[PDB]
Amino acid sequence: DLDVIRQIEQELGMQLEPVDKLKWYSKGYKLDKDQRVTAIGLYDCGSDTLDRIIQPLESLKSLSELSLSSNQITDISPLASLNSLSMLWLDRNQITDIAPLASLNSLSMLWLFGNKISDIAPLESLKSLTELQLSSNQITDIAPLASLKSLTELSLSGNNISDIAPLESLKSLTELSLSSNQITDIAPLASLKSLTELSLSSNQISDIAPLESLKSLTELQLSRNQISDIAPLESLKSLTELQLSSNQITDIAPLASLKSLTELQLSRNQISDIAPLESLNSLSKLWLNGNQITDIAPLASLNSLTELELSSNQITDIAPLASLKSLSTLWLSSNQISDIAPLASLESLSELSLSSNQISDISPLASLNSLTGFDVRRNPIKRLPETITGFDMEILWNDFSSSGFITFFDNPLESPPPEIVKQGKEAVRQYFQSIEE
């Protein structure tokens, strides 16, 4: 009743507003045919909200959606008599016990991630659940979710979970978040086939045996692990994004079987040759920094690239990088490049990292007027070229790699004094014009 809504309004002193389909950040209500309250949102209503609103809440028996997200509540005992709910938002609160969440026979969506929960037994009788958010908690075991069928989106990530076997009993899921945990065996994740997004981030996984069974995946996050063989991923070609960050891998030939992949982070590994990345013409982002690779020539056939991270690698010749034109970021610092001539055609560049190399002449990078980041620290540069002061940037002598900045550090600057070059771009220009005069 609108009388109940007004009662809640003056009790909280907050202007609840007649609104539409409820969201986790909603602070109003939703009506019905004959003006019956069904959905109510209390976003950031204080820590004492639940114990003060339950009498008005139980007064109306038509409520089916409750948003108490980010209210920082500690006790949810009042959430027991409102047996007419369907969706419940309880994000980002100091909730430890979910025992009152037992009588809510009907619930289709439960959001609980930002909490301090440790025991998920009480939600064993919640039959018709379809969405569960339980990330960033202190849980260590998941037995009670086995009885929970009809789940499509599950987020159990950020806990101390080691066994995952009961997830086998759950076969309806679409997105599975299982990360920042202590997991070693993924054998249960075999009978799943409807899964599209899998986030198996930081864990002690080294044998991706059952993922071959999955076929509809489009996003695969597998980073900060101890994996070494990616041949299992060779069969699957449907992933728009597959991230393989810090690991110990030496071969990437199985990746060459993929063709629709878009963004590829391949960082901090022992990969030797990147030739298998010669047929992925649709790559928009490539992150290959911190590896032992020598030749960039096989990468001269990916003209759709837009971001390229090649830093801290053993590349000396940059010439077979002139073919690419639609490039915007180029990080290849901490390498052994010498001349930067075969980059003058990279008209679309907007950020560069050319530091910690053996580069003496900077003059070729002159036509690249689009650069909004250039970083040449720790290089043996002797003379500063005219075009170095023709860029829309300010100059810093700091050790930080900042965008919108021309940066030098630890450089034997002889003709331009280091004090002059650390004064600023205007000082560099006046010094050079005086030298001209």
Partner 1 sequence: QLQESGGGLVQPGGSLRLSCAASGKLLSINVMGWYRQAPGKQRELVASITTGGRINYADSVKGRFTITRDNAKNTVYLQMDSLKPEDTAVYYCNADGIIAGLYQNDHWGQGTQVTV
Question: Is 360 in contact with 382 (CB distance < 8 Å)?
Answer: yes
Q: Does 157 bind partner 1 (CB under 8 A)?
A: yes
Token pair, residue 380, equals 């043996």
Q: Does 92 bind partner 1 (CB under 8 A)?
A: yes
H or E segment and range at residue 110 = strand 109-111
Among 152-160, 204-212, 317-325, 408-416, the segment contacting partner 1 (CB under 8 A): 152-160
Sheet with 374-375: strands ordered across: 374-375, 405-407, 394-396
Question: Is 56 in contact with 78 (CB distance < 8 Å)?
Answer: no
Among 72-80, 93-101, 184-192, 403-411, the segment contacting partner 1 (CB under 8 A): 403-411
Among 22-30, 183-191, 274-282, 382-390, the segment contacting partner 1 (CB under 8 A): 22-30
Q: Does 71 bind partner 1 (CB under 8 A)?
A: no
Q: Does 247 bind partner 1 (CB under 8 A)?
A: no
Q: Give the nearer residue to partner 1 in terms of CB position, either 92 or 378.
A: 92
Task: Report the b/e string of 122-157 with b at 16+ CB within 10 A.
Answer: bbeebeebbbbbbbbbebebbebbeebeebeebbbb
Q: Give the nearer residue to partner 1 in terms of CB position, either 397 or 432.
A: 397
Q: Give the nearer residue to partner 1 in terms of CB position, either 44 or 141.
A: 44
Q: Does 398 bind partner 1 (CB under 8 A)?
A: yes
Residue whose token pair is 């959905």: 39
Q: Does 260 bind partner 1 (CB under 8 A)?
A: no
CB of 67 to partner 1, least distance (A): 12
Question: Is 391 in contact with 367 (CB distance < 8 Å)?
Answer: no
Q: Give the nearer residue to partner 1 in terms of CB position, either 218 or 301.
A: 218
Q: Does 177 bind partner 1 (CB under 8 A)?
A: yes
CB of 320 to partner 1, least distance (A): 29
Q: Give the nearer residue to partner 1 in terms of CB position, either 59 or 174.
A: 174
Strands (E), 215-344: 219-221, 241-243, 263-265, 285-287, 307-309, 329-331
Binding residues for partner 1, rule CB under 8 A, total 34
C-alpha triplet 241, 243, 244: angle, nearest 5°: 150
x/- site string to partner 1, residues 341 to 360, per CB under 8 A?
Answer: --------------------
CA distance 246 to 334: 18
Q: Does 93 bind partner 1 (CB under 8 A)?
A: no
By CB atoms closer than 10 A (0-12, 13-18, 19+), residue 436 is exposed
Among 97-105, 163-171, 197-205, 250-258, the segment contacting partner 1 (CB under 8 A): 197-205
Q: Does 221 bind partner 1 (CB under 8 A)?
A: yes
Among 47-55, 284-292, 309-317, 392-400, the segment contacting partner 1 (CB under 8 A): 392-400
Q: What length is written for the chain?
A: 437
- Beta-carbon contacts of residue 186 (< 8 Å; ≥ 6 apart): 164, 200, 205, 208, 209, 210, 211
Please give the residue ranges that form the binding site for partner 1 (CB under 8 A): 24-25, 27, 43-44, 70, 91-92, 113-114, 135-136, 155, 157-158, 175-177, 179-180, 197, 199, 201, 219, 221, 394, 396, 398, 400, 402-405, 424
